[PDB]
Amino acid sequence: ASGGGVPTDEEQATGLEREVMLAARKGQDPYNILAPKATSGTKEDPNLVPSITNKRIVGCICEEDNSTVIWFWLHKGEAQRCPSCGTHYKLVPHQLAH
Template sequence: MFVRRTAFALARRTPGRALAKRPLSLSMARCDKAKDEATTLGKIVSYDEVKTEEDLIPPGAKAGTVPTDLEQATGLERLELLGKMQGIDIFDMRPLDASRKDSDPLGTLDSPIIVHGAGDEQFAGCTGYPADSHTVVWLTVSRDRPIERCGECGNVVKLNYVGPTDDHHGHGHDHHSYQEPKTFADYVKPEYWYR
């Protein structure tokens, strides 16, 4: 307590010039450096103009200001923001169509609910039919196991892989050493399989 009071008392007695002395030449050098950095940083482009990853580097905020999301977001987040500014939902975040019409019922083995995914694995949340009839059950579909059924309501989802066809890790997708553990479903007669 005593130390804190002493520090405040000394700070009040110290003239402002003594705290913030720096030569004018140093201020000019800092100003020139800021101008150089502003010209080398990225620029704001529209969604249609994005061609390379360098187009997704923002210019940043001006010195002394708080950056906006558009000024600081990079990569996929920046691409999503640029798309939203033009009314494009690049990740297609709408709820999946799980309607069950008489002519074309979705959510069955014959007509599953399609889940688009660019990765090896995709999660889909099922709330039942009609909507919100049970708590969310998260289903996992993958490239190895593209069809999954909800244990609560019986809805069936299927992965539609939309990612790249080649593997960028230097090996093929089917040549990995991981094997999925066996479950009770692996011992069901083949005629009852839905794979």
């Protein structure tokens, strides 16, 4: 008692919407829709910060439920530490395409 005729997103989504949809299907987040899960943040196990360039701003919430976020530029090269609580971050430059 029904019928079809309505395009699906898979058929008709375009542009950035389509990129986000396709990346989500691969479990990738090129457009920063999700919050990344932290590592232990030690020097051996730093948080890995992707960037399309050679530096990116990091905000670090030192203890859970701190209202104060600590912000700093992370540069390419040796891992850096959050000024407040020392947790390590390392930039991993990469093109957007995965």
